[PDB]
Protein backbone atom coordinates (compact mmCIF):
# COMPACT_ATOMS: atom_id res chain seq x y z
CA UNK A 1 0.00 0.00 0.00
CA UNK A 2 1.00 3.66 -0.40
CA UNK A 3 3.13 4.86 2.53
CA UNK A 4 5.23 7.94 3.26
CA UNK A 5 8.25 6.13 1.80
CA UNK A 6 6.41 5.13 -1.40
CA UNK A 7 7.95 6.62 -4.54
CA UNK A 8 5.42 7.71 -7.17
CA UNK A 9 6.60 7.27 -10.75
CA UNK A 10 6.00 10.66 -12.41
CA UNK A 11 3.81 11.67 -9.47
CA UNK A 12 3.86 12.89 -5.87
CA UNK A 13 2.44 11.77 -2.54
CA UNK A 14 -0.62 13.44 -1.04
CA UNK A 15 -2.32 12.88 2.31
CA UNK A 16 -5.93 12.93 3.46
CA UNK A 17 -7.37 12.24 6.91
CA UNK A 18 -7.17 8.46 6.57
CA UNK A 19 -4.79 7.43 3.79
CA UNK A 20 -2.01 8.40 1.38
CA UNK A 21 -2.11 8.19 -2.41
CA UNK A 22 -0.09 9.20 -5.46
CA UNK A 23 -1.26 12.14 -7.56
CA UNK A 24 -0.02 12.50 -11.13
CA UNK A 25 2.03 15.34 -12.59
CA UNK A 26 0.71 17.68 -15.29
CA UNK A 27 -1.79 15.79 -17.47
CA UNK A 28 -0.76 12.20 -16.76
CA UNK A 29 -3.05 9.40 -15.53
CA UNK A 30 -2.68 6.60 -13.00
CA UNK A 31 -2.06 3.11 -14.41
CA UNK A 32 -1.60 1.69 -10.91
CA UNK A 33 -1.48 3.16 -7.42
CA UNK A 34 2.14 4.33 -7.78
CA UNK A 35 2.70 4.92 -11.52
CA UNK A 36 1.56 7.74 -13.81
CA UNK A 37 1.72 7.67 -17.61
CA UNK A 38 0.53 9.63 -20.61
CA UNK A 39 -3.07 8.97 -21.65
CA UNK A 40 -4.12 8.15 -25.19
CA UNK A 41 -6.77 10.41 -26.69
CA UNK A 42 -8.48 7.83 -28.93
CA UNK A 43 -8.91 4.10 -28.37
CA UNK A 44 -8.11 2.07 -31.48
CA UNK A 45 -6.01 -0.86 -32.67
CA UNK A 46 -2.76 1.07 -32.12
CA UNK A 47 -3.56 2.01 -28.49
CA UNK A 48 -4.89 -1.31 -27.14
CA UNK A 49 -4.03 -1.91 -23.45
CA UNK A 50 -2.70 1.68 -23.16
CA UNK A 51 -4.09 3.99 -20.44
CA UNK A 52 -6.95 6.33 -21.32
CA UNK A 53 -7.63 7.65 -17.82
CA UNK A 54 -7.16 6.95 -14.14
CA UNK A 55 -7.21 3.14 -13.79
CA UNK A 56 -8.59 2.85 -17.34
CA UNK A 57 -7.23 1.09 -20.43
CA UNK A 58 -8.36 0.80 -24.03
CA UNK A 59 -10.13 -2.53 -24.49
CA UNK A 60 -10.54 -4.45 -27.74
CA UNK A 61 -14.26 -5.29 -28.02
CA UNK A 62 -14.80 -8.40 -30.13
CA UNK A 63 -17.73 -8.01 -32.49
CA UNK A 64 -18.89 -7.63 -36.09
CA UNK A 65 -16.83 -5.56 -36.54
CA UNK A 66 -14.24 -5.21 -33.78
CA UNK A 67 -14.44 -1.96 -31.81
CA UNK A 68 -12.43 -0.29 -29.03
CA UNK A 69 -13.59 1.30 -25.78
CA UNK A 70 -12.02 2.91 -22.72
CA UNK A 71 -12.99 0.85 -19.66
CA UNK A 72 -11.95 0.69 -16.01
CA UNK A 73 -9.46 -1.96 -14.91
CA UNK A 74 -10.44 -5.06 -12.94
CA UNK A 75 -11.83 -4.12 -9.55
CA UNK A 76 -13.03 -0.65 -10.60
CA UNK A 77 -16.40 0.74 -11.66
CA UNK A 78 -17.08 3.92 -13.64
CA UNK A 79 -19.16 6.37 -11.58
CA UNK A 80 -19.76 9.82 -13.09
CA UNK A 81 -17.06 8.94 -15.65
CA UNK A 82 -14.45 8.28 -12.94
CA UNK A 83 -13.09 4.83 -12.09
CA UNK A 84 -13.36 3.98 -8.38
CA UNK A 85 -13.12 0.70 -6.43
CA UNK A 86 -16.23 -1.46 -6.80
CA UNK A 87 -16.75 -1.43 -3.02
CA UNK A 88 -17.13 2.38 -3.23
CA UNK A 89 -20.01 2.33 -5.73
CA UNK A 90 -22.74 3.59 -3.37
CA UNK A 91 -20.60 5.25 -0.69
CA UNK A 92 -21.34 8.93 -0.08
CA UNK A 93 -18.72 10.74 1.98
CA UNK A 94 -19.28 14.47 1.44
CA UNK A 95 -16.09 16.33 2.42
CA UNK A 96 -13.94 13.38 1.45
CA UNK A 97 -13.59 10.36 -0.80
CA UNK A 98 -14.24 6.64 -0.48
CA UNK A 99 -11.27 4.27 -0.34
CA UNK A 100 -10.94 0.51 -0.10
CA UNK A 101 -10.69 -0.92 3.42
CA UNK A 102 -9.03 -4.33 3.84
CA UNK A 103 -8.98 -4.56 7.66
CA UNK A 104 -12.33 -6.40 7.91
CA UNK A 105 -12.88 -10.02 6.80
CA UNK A 106 -14.61 -8.69 3.66
CA UNK A 107 -13.55 -5.75 1.51
CA UNK A 108 -15.42 -2.56 2.39
CA UNK A 109 -15.51 1.09 1.42
CA UNK A 110 -14.59 3.69 4.04
CA UNK A 111 -14.55 7.47 3.91
CA UNK A 112 -11.22 9.29 3.99
CA UNK A 113 -11.78 12.96 4.74
CA UNK A 114 -10.34 16.24 3.53
CA UNK A 115 -7.74 17.82 5.79
CA UNK A 116 -9.69 19.50 8.56
CA UNK A 117 -12.47 16.88 8.57
CA UNK A 118 -12.75 13.47 10.26
CA UNK A 119 -15.27 10.61 10.16
CA UNK A 120 -18.43 11.44 12.12
CA UNK A 121 -19.52 8.40 14.14
CA UNK A 122 -22.90 10.11 14.58
CA UNK A 123 -23.32 10.29 10.77
CA UNK A 124 -22.37 6.80 9.50
CA UNK A 125 -18.65 7.74 9.59
CA UNK A 126 -19.12 10.32 6.84
CA UNK A 127 -16.81 13.33 6.57
CA UNK A 128 -19.05 15.82 8.36
CA UNK A 129 -17.09 16.40 11.60
CA UNK A 130 -14.27 18.91 12.06
CA UNK A 131 -10.99 17.42 13.23
CA UNK A 132 -7.24 17.84 12.94
CA UNK A 133 -4.80 15.64 11.01
CA UNK A 134 -1.02 15.88 11.36
CA UNK A 135 0.93 15.88 8.10
CA UNK A 136 3.11 12.76 7.90
CA UNK A 137 4.72 13.51 4.52
CA UNK A 138 8.52 13.71 4.41
CA UNK A 139 9.32 16.70 2.20
CA UNK A 140 12.65 17.87 0.83
CA UNK A 141 14.76 19.75 3.36
CA UNK A 142 15.50 23.46 2.80
CA UNK A 143 13.36 23.42 -0.36
CA UNK A 144 9.90 22.02 0.48
CA UNK A 145 7.33 22.16 3.28
CA UNK A 146 4.06 20.36 3.94
CA UNK A 147 0.95 22.49 3.38
CA UNK A 148 -2.77 21.81 2.94
CA UNK A 149 -4.24 22.74 -0.46
CA UNK A 150 -7.70 21.82 -1.80
CA UNK A 151 -8.27 19.50 1.16
CA UNK A 152 -5.05 17.45 0.88
CA UNK A 153 -1.54 17.70 2.29
CA UNK A 154 1.30 17.95 -0.20
CA UNK A 155 4.90 19.14 -0.29
CA UNK A 156 4.92 22.75 -1.48
CA UNK A 157 7.91 24.74 -2.69
CA UNK A 158 9.07 27.40 -0.25
CA UNK A 159 9.24 31.05 -1.30
CA UNK A 160 12.36 31.52 -3.40
CA UNK A 161 13.09 27.79 -3.82
CA UNK A 162 11.23 27.68 -7.12
Amino acid at each position, epitope marked *: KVTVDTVCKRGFLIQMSGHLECKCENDLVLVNEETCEEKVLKCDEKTVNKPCGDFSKCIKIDGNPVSYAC*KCNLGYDMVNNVCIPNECKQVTCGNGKCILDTSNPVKTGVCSCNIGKVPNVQDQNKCSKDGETKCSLKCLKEQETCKAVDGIYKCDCKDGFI
Partner: single-chain antibody
Amino acid sequence: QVQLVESGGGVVQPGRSLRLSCAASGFSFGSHDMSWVRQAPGKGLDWVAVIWYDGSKKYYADSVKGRFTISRDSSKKTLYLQMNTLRAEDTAVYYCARAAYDSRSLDYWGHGTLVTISSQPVLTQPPSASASLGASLSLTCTLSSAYSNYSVDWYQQRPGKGPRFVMRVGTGGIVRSKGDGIPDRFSVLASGLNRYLTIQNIQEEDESDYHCGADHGSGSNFLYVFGTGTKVTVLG
Protein backbone atom coordinates in the same frame (compact mmCIF):
# COMPACT_ATOMS: atom_id res chain seq x y z
CA GLN B 1 -21.47 -13.75 -7.89
CA VAL B 2 -22.97 -12.31 -11.09
CA GLN B 3 -26.74 -12.07 -10.72
CA LEU B 4 -29.54 -10.49 -12.76
CA VAL B 5 -33.07 -10.44 -11.32
CA GLU B 6 -35.99 -9.08 -13.35
CA SER B 7 -39.16 -7.55 -11.92
CA GLY B 8 -42.36 -5.84 -12.99
CA GLY B 9 -44.05 -8.45 -15.17
CA GLY B 10 -47.75 -9.21 -15.25
CA VAL B 11 -50.97 -9.01 -17.25
CA VAL B 12 -51.78 -5.74 -19.06
CA GLN B 13 -54.57 -4.73 -21.41
CA PRO B 14 -53.66 -3.69 -24.98
CA GLY B 15 -52.81 0.00 -25.16
CA ARG B 16 -51.52 0.48 -21.60
CA SER B 17 -47.99 0.68 -20.18
CA LEU B 18 -45.64 -1.37 -18.01
CA ARG B 19 -42.13 -0.79 -16.61
CA LEU B 20 -39.68 -3.66 -16.11
CA SER B 21 -36.63 -3.62 -13.86
CA CYS B 22 -33.44 -5.66 -13.59
CA ALA B 23 -31.38 -5.38 -10.40
CA ALA B 24 -27.76 -6.33 -11.13
CA SER B 25 -25.22 -7.58 -8.59
CA GLY B 26 -21.82 -9.25 -8.74
CA PHE B 27 -19.98 -7.15 -11.34
CA SER B 28 -18.91 -3.64 -12.32
CA PHE B 29 -22.26 -2.32 -13.54
CA GLY B 30 -20.67 0.52 -15.52
CA SER B 31 -18.27 -1.66 -17.52
CA HIS B 32 -20.91 -3.73 -19.37
CA ASP B 33 -23.49 -3.06 -22.05
CA MET B 34 -26.96 -4.20 -20.97
CA SER B 35 -29.69 -5.60 -23.23
CA TRP B 36 -33.30 -6.75 -23.08
CA VAL B 37 -34.29 -9.89 -25.02
CA ARG B 38 -37.80 -11.34 -25.30
CA GLN B 39 -39.12 -14.79 -26.22
CA ALA B 40 -42.73 -15.41 -27.26
CA PRO B 41 -44.41 -18.73 -26.35
CA GLY B 42 -43.04 -21.49 -28.55
CA LYS B 43 -40.62 -19.24 -30.46
CA GLY B 44 -36.97 -18.18 -30.41
CA LEU B 45 -35.12 -15.25 -28.91
CA ASP B 46 -35.84 -11.68 -30.04
CA TRP B 47 -33.52 -8.78 -29.19
CA VAL B 48 -35.35 -5.72 -27.84
CA ALA B 49 -32.88 -2.99 -26.85
CA VAL B 50 -29.34 -2.26 -25.65
CA ILE B 51 -27.72 0.49 -23.59
CA TRP B 52 -24.02 1.31 -23.61
CA TYR B 53 -21.73 0.65 -20.66
CA ASP B 54 -21.00 4.35 -20.14
CA GLY B 55 -24.44 5.47 -21.29
CA SER B 56 -23.64 7.12 -24.61
CA LYS B 57 -25.86 5.05 -26.93
CA LYS B 58 -29.28 3.43 -26.94
CA TYR B 59 -30.46 1.12 -29.73
CA TYR B 60 -33.82 -0.58 -30.26
CA ALA B 61 -35.48 -3.16 -32.49
CA ASP B 62 -37.77 -1.86 -35.22
CA SER B 63 -40.77 -3.68 -33.73
CA VAL B 64 -40.48 -1.60 -30.53
CA LYS B 65 -39.16 1.66 -32.01
CA GLY B 66 -41.01 4.63 -30.55
CA ARG B 67 -42.77 2.57 -27.87
CA PHE B 68 -40.04 1.12 -25.61
CA THR B 69 -37.31 3.04 -23.76
CA ILE B 70 -34.26 1.47 -22.10
CA SER B 71 -32.60 3.20 -19.15
CA ARG B 72 -30.08 2.59 -16.39
CA ASP B 73 -29.82 4.23 -12.98
CA SER B 74 -26.10 3.64 -12.57
CA SER B 75 -26.31 4.43 -8.84
CA LYS B 76 -28.87 1.76 -7.93
CA LYS B 77 -27.28 -0.74 -10.40
CA THR B 78 -30.67 -1.20 -12.05
CA LEU B 79 -31.71 -1.57 -15.69
CA TYR B 80 -35.15 -0.34 -16.75
CA LEU B 81 -37.40 -0.94 -19.76
CA GLN B 82 -40.38 1.38 -20.16
CA MET B 83 -43.07 -0.13 -22.42
CA ASN B 84 -45.82 2.12 -23.77
CA THR B 85 -48.65 1.26 -26.17
CA LEU B 86 -48.52 -2.46 -25.47
CA ARG B 87 -49.83 -4.97 -28.00
CA ALA B 88 -50.71 -8.66 -28.01
CA GLU B 89 -47.58 -9.03 -30.17
CA ASP B 90 -45.54 -8.07 -27.08
CA THR B 91 -46.60 -11.12 -25.04
CA ALA B 92 -43.33 -12.84 -24.13
CA VAL B 93 -40.85 -13.61 -21.39
CA TYR B 94 -38.41 -10.70 -21.09
CA TYR B 95 -34.80 -11.35 -20.05
CA CYS B 96 -32.25 -8.72 -19.13
CA ALA B 97 -28.90 -9.82 -20.54
CA ARG B 98 -25.38 -8.59 -19.84
CA ALA B 99 -22.67 -8.27 -22.47
CA ALA B 100 -19.13 -9.43 -21.75
CA TYR B 101 -16.39 -7.00 -20.76
CA ASP B 102 -14.55 -7.41 -24.09
CA SER B 103 -17.13 -8.76 -26.55
CA ARG B 104 -20.67 -8.29 -27.84
CA SER B 105 -21.63 -11.75 -26.54
CA LEU B 106 -24.45 -11.86 -23.98
CA ASP B 107 -22.55 -13.83 -21.36
CA TYR B 108 -25.07 -13.55 -18.49
CA TRP B 109 -28.87 -13.77 -18.51
CA GLY B 110 -31.65 -13.27 -16.02
CA HIS B 111 -34.34 -15.88 -15.44
CA GLY B 112 -37.00 -13.72 -17.12
CA THR B 113 -40.38 -12.22 -16.26
CA LEU B 114 -43.60 -12.89 -18.15
CA VAL B 115 -45.60 -10.08 -19.77
CA THR B 116 -49.08 -10.99 -21.01
CA ILE B 117 -51.00 -8.48 -23.14
CA SER B 118 -54.60 -9.70 -23.28
CA SER B 119 -58.15 -8.35 -23.27
CA GLN B 120 -31.50 -9.03 -45.08
CA PRO B 121 -31.31 -12.41 -43.33
CA VAL B 122 -28.04 -12.80 -41.45
CA LEU B 123 -28.47 -16.11 -39.61
CA THR B 124 -30.24 -19.44 -40.09
CA GLN B 125 -30.52 -22.70 -38.10
CA PRO B 126 -32.37 -25.95 -38.78
CA PRO B 127 -35.48 -26.24 -36.59
CA SER B 128 -34.59 -29.54 -34.90
CA ALA B 129 -31.87 -32.14 -34.38
CA SER B 130 -31.65 -35.51 -32.65
CA ALA B 131 -29.03 -37.97 -31.43
CA SER B 132 -28.70 -41.03 -29.22
CA LEU B 133 -27.09 -41.08 -25.79
CA GLY B 134 -23.30 -41.13 -25.87
CA ALA B 135 -23.12 -40.13 -29.55
CA SER B 136 -21.84 -36.92 -31.14
CA LEU B 137 -23.98 -34.12 -32.58
CA SER B 138 -23.03 -31.07 -34.65
CA LEU B 139 -25.43 -28.12 -34.73
CA THR B 140 -25.23 -25.86 -37.78
CA CYS B 141 -25.65 -22.09 -38.06
CA THR B 142 -25.38 -20.66 -41.58
CA LEU B 143 -24.50 -17.06 -42.46
CA SER B 144 -25.24 -15.15 -45.63
CA SER B 145 -22.31 -14.60 -47.97
CA ALA B 146 -22.47 -10.84 -47.28
CA TYR B 147 -21.50 -11.62 -43.66
CA SER B 148 -19.11 -14.50 -44.35
CA ASN B 149 -16.55 -13.24 -41.85
CA TYR B 150 -18.94 -12.81 -38.91
CA SER B 151 -18.57 -14.42 -35.51
CA VAL B 152 -21.62 -16.03 -33.95
CA ASP B 153 -22.66 -16.75 -30.37
CA TRP B 154 -24.25 -20.00 -29.22
CA TYR B 155 -26.75 -20.15 -26.35
CA GLN B 156 -28.27 -23.11 -24.51
CA GLN B 157 -31.81 -23.00 -23.12
CA ARG B 158 -32.67 -25.97 -20.93
CA PRO B 159 -36.38 -26.88 -20.93
CA GLY B 160 -38.31 -24.61 -18.59
CA LYS B 161 -35.28 -22.34 -17.98
CA GLY B 162 -33.77 -19.27 -19.58
CA PRO B 163 -30.82 -19.26 -21.98
CA ARG B 164 -27.16 -19.30 -21.03
CA PHE B 165 -24.06 -18.43 -23.04
CA VAL B 166 -21.99 -21.30 -24.42
CA MET B 167 -19.31 -20.11 -26.84
CA ARG B 168 -18.55 -17.59 -29.58
CA VAL B 169 -17.00 -19.01 -32.76
CA GLY B 170 -15.36 -17.03 -35.55
CA THR B 171 -13.79 -17.73 -38.90
CA GLY B 172 -11.28 -20.55 -38.65
CA GLY B 173 -13.21 -22.16 -35.80
CA ILE B 174 -11.53 -19.94 -33.20
CA VAL B 175 -13.12 -19.80 -29.75
CA ARG B 176 -13.44 -16.04 -29.29
CA SER B 177 -15.03 -16.29 -25.83
CA LYS B 178 -16.43 -19.05 -23.63
CA GLY B 179 -19.21 -19.03 -21.05
CA ASP B 180 -19.06 -20.15 -17.44
CA GLY B 181 -19.84 -23.71 -16.41
CA ILE B 182 -19.57 -25.18 -19.92
CA PRO B 183 -18.43 -28.83 -19.94
CA ASP B 184 -15.52 -29.99 -22.08
CA ARG B 185 -17.91 -32.07 -24.20
CA PHE B 186 -18.90 -28.83 -25.98
CA SER B 187 -16.75 -27.56 -28.85
CA VAL B 188 -17.08 -25.32 -31.91
CA LEU B 189 -16.04 -25.53 -35.56
CA ALA B 190 -16.37 -23.47 -38.73
CA SER B 191 -16.38 -23.99 -42.49
CA GLY B 192 -17.02 -21.19 -44.97
CA LEU B 193 -20.45 -19.75 -44.25
CA ASN B 194 -21.22 -22.35 -41.57
CA ARG B 195 -20.58 -22.16 -37.84
CA TYR B 196 -20.91 -25.30 -35.74
CA LEU B 197 -21.50 -26.23 -32.12
CA THR B 198 -20.50 -29.83 -31.44
CA ILE B 199 -21.33 -32.05 -28.47
CA GLN B 200 -19.61 -35.35 -27.70
CA ASN B 201 -20.86 -38.03 -25.29
CA ILE B 202 -24.37 -36.59 -25.30
CA GLN B 203 -26.27 -36.66 -22.00
CA GLU B 204 -29.93 -36.31 -21.09
CA GLU B 205 -29.12 -32.82 -19.80
CA ASP B 206 -27.99 -31.79 -23.30
CA GLU B 207 -31.65 -31.91 -24.39
CA SER B 208 -32.18 -28.19 -24.97
CA ASP B 209 -33.03 -25.47 -27.46
CA TYR B 210 -29.75 -24.12 -28.89
CA HIS B 211 -29.84 -20.58 -30.27
CA CYS B 212 -27.43 -18.91 -32.69
CA GLY B 213 -26.85 -15.15 -32.46
CA ALA B 214 -24.64 -12.34 -33.74
CA ASP B 215 -24.25 -8.57 -33.39
CA HIS B 216 -24.34 -6.26 -36.41
CA GLY B 217 -22.90 -2.79 -35.87
CA SER B 218 -22.81 -1.13 -39.29
CA GLY B 219 -22.33 2.63 -39.41
CA SER B 220 -23.83 4.24 -36.33
CA ASN B 221 -26.51 1.57 -35.87
CA PHE B 222 -26.52 -1.61 -33.81
CA LEU B 223 -28.64 -4.73 -34.10
CA TYR B 224 -28.43 -8.17 -32.52
CA VAL B 225 -29.95 -11.03 -34.53
CA PHE B 226 -30.96 -14.53 -33.46
CA GLY B 227 -31.60 -17.67 -35.43
CA THR B 228 -34.79 -19.66 -35.00
CA GLY B 229 -33.26 -22.07 -32.46
CA THR B 230 -32.44 -25.77 -32.93
CA LYS B 231 -34.46 -27.97 -30.56
CA VAL B 232 -32.37 -31.02 -29.67
CA THR B 233 -33.95 -34.31 -28.57
CA VAL B 234 -31.82 -36.97 -26.88
CA LEU B 235 -32.87 -40.54 -27.66
CA GLY B 236 -32.43 -43.25 -25.04
